[PDB]
Structure formats: C-alpha cells, structure tokens
Amino acid sequence: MESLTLQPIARVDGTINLPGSKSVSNRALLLAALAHGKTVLTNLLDSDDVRHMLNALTALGVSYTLSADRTRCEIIGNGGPLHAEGALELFLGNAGTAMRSLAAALCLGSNDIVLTGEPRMKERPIGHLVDALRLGGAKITYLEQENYPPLRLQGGFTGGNVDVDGSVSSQFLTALLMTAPLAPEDTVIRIKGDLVSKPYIDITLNLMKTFGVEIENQHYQQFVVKGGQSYQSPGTYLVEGDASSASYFLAAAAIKGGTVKVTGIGRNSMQGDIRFADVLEKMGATICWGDDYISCTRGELNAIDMDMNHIPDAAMTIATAALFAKGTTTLRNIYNWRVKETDRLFAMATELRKVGAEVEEGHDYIRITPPEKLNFAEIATYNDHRMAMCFSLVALSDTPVTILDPKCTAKTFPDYFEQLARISQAA
Ligand SMILES: O=C(O)C1=C[C@@H](OP(=O)(O)O)[C@@H](O)[C@H](O)C1
C-alpha cells in the first residue's frame, strides 16, 4: 500500500499559515445553508470532512460557489430547513461533524433522506442523538445496526422536552442546539449527566450567535431554546485556522525547535484546542500569544499527568510528544478516543510500542514510558488522519519513520507533510 518515509529532522523553525478549522467550517456551512441571505466564508478548510458536507448541501439543492483553492465559499442561504425525498442517500465519509449535525437538522419538517458513510462510520455511535430527536418527535430508522448509521430520516422534530446523554459525544448536543431554534415549538434540552468535550459546545453556541441565534445555557445541564427562529447571514465570515492541526507544529518546536509560529489562531480563538499550548508550557516549552498567532519555542520537556477531556483531539499529539519527555506521561479521561476515527486508545498504544515505548492502555487513559532511544517502525494509521500526523513527530529524533497511508491526513489536512517539511531544517 502507499507509504511515506520521513527522514530525521534536525531542527524545526518557521511559520505556518494554518488551514481552516474543520469544526468551524462544517458548522458555518450548515448554518449558512439554513440561513437567509448570502454568506461569504473565507479561510474555509478544504479537506475530506468539509467536502462531504459541501457535497451533501449540493445534493440537497443548496447553491454555492468555491474559489480556485476551495477556501472561499459564497453560499446562497435556503432561508429555512433543507429538504429532499425519495430516501436520497447522502454519503458522509467518516465525518462526525457532518453525520451528527445533519442527522438532527434534517429532522425538521418532512423529509425522506438516508445518511451513510464509510465502514467505520457505521461503527461510530449515534443512538444518544437519535434517542433525543425521537423524544422531540422525529421519525428515525436504523437501516443496519441499532444505535449506528446508516439512518433513514423521515422528519417530525417539533421540539418539546428532550433529554440527551452527553457522556460519549458532545456532537449530539451540538446537533440538537443548531436544530432546535428552527423547530416550531420551544425546546428544553436536559443533559442526563456528564458532558464530555465541553469546549466544542462553546464553539457551537458561538457560531449560532454569529448566525443570529442565542439560547439560554443553564450551567451546561439544561439548554432552553425558543422555537420559530431563523438564521441570518452574517455577511462575510472568517473561519479560524485549525487549532487541532496547529498542535503538531507547536509540539514539533517543543521537541526540536527552534521557534514555530502558527497563524490564523490566537488568544481570542473560540477553539478549545488552543489550550494544547498550555500543556506544552506545563511540560517546559515557552509559548507566545498574539492576536493572530501562537508560537512555541523549545525549552525542555517533562512528563505530565493530566485529565485531557477538554482537548481530546490535540491530546493525541501529547502521546507521541511524550516519547521525547523526561519521565512517564499519563493522559486521563479520554474514553471517547475509542469511538472516533478508530479506537485511538488501542491504536496509539499499539503504534507507540512499535517505536520502543512501554505503554499501559487503560480503559480510559494511556500511560507512556519513553525508551532510552527510539527505533524504526512502519506505522499503521487506521484510516485516521491524526495517527499519521502524531507519528510524523517520531522523525524529530535520530531515526526515520515510515507512515502507512499518508494520504489519510486529507480528512482534515491534505497538505500536512508539505507543511511539516516547510518548518523542517537540516541545520
Ligand atoms: O464538534 C466538533 O467539531 C468535534 C467534537 C469532538 O468530538 P466528541 O464530542 O465526540 O469528543 C472532536 O473529537 C471532533 O473531532 C470534532
């Protein structure tokens, strides 16, 4: 199969202009499609997950144009819920941000649409969201395994009292929050218990406000939404650079810099993953903040023991950075790594051991003891962009590393290796 071998990188230094945020991009596209008026999105991410959302909007009849590099999108708002019949099939790859949000949005009014995706997506849970949508009136059918896509959506979400489990994915609550304002009746969303990946809920509320809608957040345990609202185009909107994509470059500097500056995000960013910089600082790196940049400069690197529930995606980057730290690193409260692009706890533990680390794969945590020196390994990537990007960091040592299926980075960052190479120096 395809592979890429990275030669040892002696030092990293430079500036990277980040690709757009996948999280912001897909929310902005769906809201722009539902809104009244024309929205111009700039710095939109061009990656598989965004392309699947764009294809879905095209299939649903939404009109838009894209610039040559696909980062500028002029969307003609539908001025209300999107519709299709005939069990129209929308293929969503392994894009959770599209699968979960569209599963809820397309329950407004009447419809007959099927949502499906790649094999792994048919193994990623969605029952908590379906349960909530049904309590609000939606008719949803599991076409294969109960609690997982594919789904046949026949509409009917009118609002009301809806309970939702927030313990496995914040994407379910995000989906409900963006959908409820357009339902005819008011909706009260009660969180059953714990809420994981909380910062992503803040991203959703931020985007909804940009598109003209606010709701009552009662300490993240209950959300009161007024029905009968309409989203409105914000005019021109700048999509933040991707803070998760930034993690690899800031970590590279913490390991082998040099100073690496990423632009497109800064101290005012809405993304929870900018807090990844705080972790590097705790490990011994120096961080600089600007209005439109974050930079990291090599200091030292010491192991940490931290609850990473607030930054589950960027946290994976700490797992390979831990190979270069002094001491044993423990990342806790990351159970849902198991239900994402791949089971990330199994995958990370398996590949880390291949380069020499002693690793304890806990049920919802991972403990990593680095080897005195790394060895060469051919890294399996599990159709997971982040496994490829995380393991690229192994090359910031005396050994090369071979990454299988390097194009899997295209899920959120097609140009990843060219960008890592841009900051890679021989001297
Ligand atoms: O809503 C979003 O943009 C995302 C929320 C997170 O999922 P969970 O809430 O399942 O942790 C994150 O892991 C995913 O990559 C993107």
DSSP per position, 156-175: ----EEEEEEESS-HHHHHH
Single out the residue in 193, 223, 253 at which a domain terminates: 223
Residue 196: other Cβ atoms inside 10 A: 19
The Cα 427–Cα 425 span in angstroms is 6
Residue 233 located in a structural domain:
no
Closest residue CA from atom 16 of ligand 1 = 23
Which residue has tokens 């159970």? 335
- Name every residue whose Cβ is closer than 8 Å to that of residue 418 and which is 6 or more positions away in sequence: none
The Cα 135–Cα 139 span in angstroms is 10
Single out the residue in 188, 223, 258 at which a domain terminates: 223
Residue 232 located in a structural domain:
no
Residue 235 located in a structural domain:
no
Ligand 1 center to 171 CA (angstroms): 6
The Cα 269–Cα 21 span in angstroms is 11
Q: Find out whether 422 is annotated in a ligand binding site.
A: no
Domain of 85 in residue numbering reads as 20-223
Same domain, 203 and 56: yes
Ligand 1 center to 277 CA (angstroms): 19
CATH number at residue 321: 3.65.10.10
Structure method:
X-ray
Same domain, 41 and 14: no
Same domain, 203 and 251: no
Residue 236 located in a structural domain:
no
Same domain, 106 and 209: yes
Same domain, 134 and 245: no
- Name every residue whose Cβ is closer than 8 Å to that of residue 421 and which is 6 or more positions away in sequence: none
Same domain, 283 and 299: yes
The residue to mutate among 313, 317, 342, 345, having the most atoms of ligand 1 within 8 angstroms of its beta carbon, is 313
Same domain, 52 and 66: yes
H/E segment holding residue 261: strand 259-263
| Domains of the chain: total | 2
Q: Find out whether 27 is annotated in a ligand binding site.
A: yes
Same domain, 408 and 335: yes
Q: Which burial class, exposed, middle or buried, applies to 66 when counting CB atoms under 10 A from its CB (0-12, 13-18, 19+)?
A: middle
Same domain, 409 and 279: yes
Single out the residue in 191, 223, 255 at which a domain terminates: 223
Considering the candidates 49, 313, 384, 405, report the single residue annotated as catalytic.
313
405 catalytic per annotation: no
Mark 381-395 as b/e (b = at least 16 C-beta within 10 Å).
Answer: bbbbbbbbbbbbbbb
Same domain, 164 and 293: no
Q: What is the resolution of this structure in A?
A: 1.5
Which residues lie across from 299 on neighbouring strands? none
Same domain, 284 and 146: no
Same domain, 4 and 53: no
H/E segment holding residue 51: helix 48-59
Q: What residues are in contact with ligand 1 under a 6 Å CB criterion?
A: 23, 96-97, 169-171, 174, 196-197, 200, 312-313, 336
Long-range contacts for 207-216 (Cβ within 8 Å, ≥24 apart)? Answer: 207/24, 207/27, 207/28, 207/31, 207/178, 208/31, 208/177, 208/178, 208/181, 210/31, 210/234, 210/237, 211/31, 211/32, 211/35, 212/35, 213/181, 215/177, 215/180, 215/181
- Secondary structure class of 76 (helix, strand, coil): strand
